[PDB]
Amino acid sequence: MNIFEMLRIDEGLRLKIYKDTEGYYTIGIGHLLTKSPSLNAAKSELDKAIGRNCNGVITKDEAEKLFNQDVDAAVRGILRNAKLKPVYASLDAVRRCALINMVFQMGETGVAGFTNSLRMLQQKRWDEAAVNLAKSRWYNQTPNRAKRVITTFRTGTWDAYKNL
Numbered sequence: 001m002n003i004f005e006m007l008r009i010d011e012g013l014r015l016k017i018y019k020d021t022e023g024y025y026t027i028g029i030g031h032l033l034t035k036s037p038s039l040n041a042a043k044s045e046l047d048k049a050i051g052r053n054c055n056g057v058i059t060k061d062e063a064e065k066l067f068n069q070d071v072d073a074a075v076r077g078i079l080r081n082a083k084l085k086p087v088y089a090s091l092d093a094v095r096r097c098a099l100i101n102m103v104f105q106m107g108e109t110g111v112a113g114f115t116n117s118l119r120m121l122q123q124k125r126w127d128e129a130a131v132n133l134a135k136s137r138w139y140n141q142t143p144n145r146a147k148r149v150i151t152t153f154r155t156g157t158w159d160a161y162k163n164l
């Protein structure tokens with residue numbers, strides 16, 4: 001299992017513009033287009049992202065290219081983040097993937113605000129970090145996904161994704 005396979009499971013793949021869990025225009029493998037309520041705004045952003053007139057739809061290759069870009073960006077973003085870098089550096093491989101997953105979903109800014117959880121992961125207090133992570137809007141709004149990521153941080157294994 002790897003970060004791509006993990007996010008592919010959590011985000012799914014849609015070749016046509018769609019609304020994410022928060023109602024925002026997205027496409028491909030969880031690639032957010034805009035928070036704006038306008039579908040045209042979304043269509044515009046899409047064309048600009050792909051470099052062609054797509055009229056709301058892309059190919060699997062295009063979706064995967066966006067995905068490659070997005071994962072790269074999340075990692076690099078973590079590495080540039082003063083608050084995130086040290087946590088990421090302290091974690092083992094599997095757990096680093098859980099952190100990337102969150103940053104992919106909420107942005108570096110959002111993740112950076114889980115201060116207490118972050119310190120717990122740095123101190124390797126797995127069970128405590130897991131309880132803290134769950135006391136969040138994130139957990140209440142997307143519980144199934146949040147549970148998979150939290151189990152990953154808790155165990156350092158891929159069990160939560162095994163059989164999906």
Ligand SMILES: [Cl-]
Pocket residue numbers: 134135136137
């Ligand atoms: Cl809460």
Ligand SMILES: [Cl-]
Pocket residue numbers: 141142143144145146
């Ligand atoms: Cl969910």
